[PDB]
Amino acid sequence: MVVKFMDVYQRSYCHPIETLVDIFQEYPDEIEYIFKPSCVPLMRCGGCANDEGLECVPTEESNITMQIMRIKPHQGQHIGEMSFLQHNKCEARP
Amino acid sequence: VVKFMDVYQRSYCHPIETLVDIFQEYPDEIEYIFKPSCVPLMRCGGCANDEGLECVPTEESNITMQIMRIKPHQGQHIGEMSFLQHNKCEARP
């Protein structure tokens, strides 16, 4: 099995990739909460690090809602719907 | 809405497509230019935590890819490069 060069090159091009994202990062006003799970997999644009000043940016986005366990210090476990941003399409840009 | 048990299971340590710099995998070739400069590989990932839990591979394989390489004073070559992939993972303390 060898992946051909043109496929390799195309596969590495800026595209949405499954990415573990910390829930607190997406819900910065909920610093006091413990979340289970603490991170969720979201489709997020990714491309190769380069020295040409290019970044991989989303050109189409959508939301996904997930039931997350939300816990305060000595309060009981709640299960709540939380919405997260996903990337559906990407492009490389300065 | 994704159900809680589905969510929880999806976040458990598992192989995830991960962009890996060729220079990270082959640091002895940092003098050279590769195209593309990174490749997508399946690698174990789990949620960051302070409980000392790591996410580690329990089954692995190699994938070979044609990569363009250029060394100083030479033209472009295309050749096979092998990379490690993770096929199964488990969380461990």
Curated annotation (Swiss-Prot), chain A:
Glycan-linked positions: 63
Tissue expression as described in the entry: Higher expression in pituitary tumors than the pituitary gland.
Disulfide bonds: 14-56, 45-90, 49-92
Induction data: By hypoxia. Regulated by growth factors, cytokines, gonadotropins, nitric oxide, hypoglycemia and oncogenic mutations.
Organism superkingdom: Eukaryota
Disease: Microvascular complications of diabetes 1: Pathological conditions that develop in numerous tissues and organs as a consequence of diabetes mellitus. They include diabetic retinopathy, diabetic nephropathy leading to end-stage renal disease, and diabetic neuropathy. Diabetic retinopathy remains the major cause of new-onset blindness among diabetic adults. It is characterized by vascular permeability and increased tissue ischemia and angiogenesis.
Family the UniProt entry places it in: Belongs to the PDGF/VEGF growth factor family.
Protein name per its UniProtKB record: Vascular endothelial growth factor A, long form
Organism of derivation: Homo sapiens (Human)
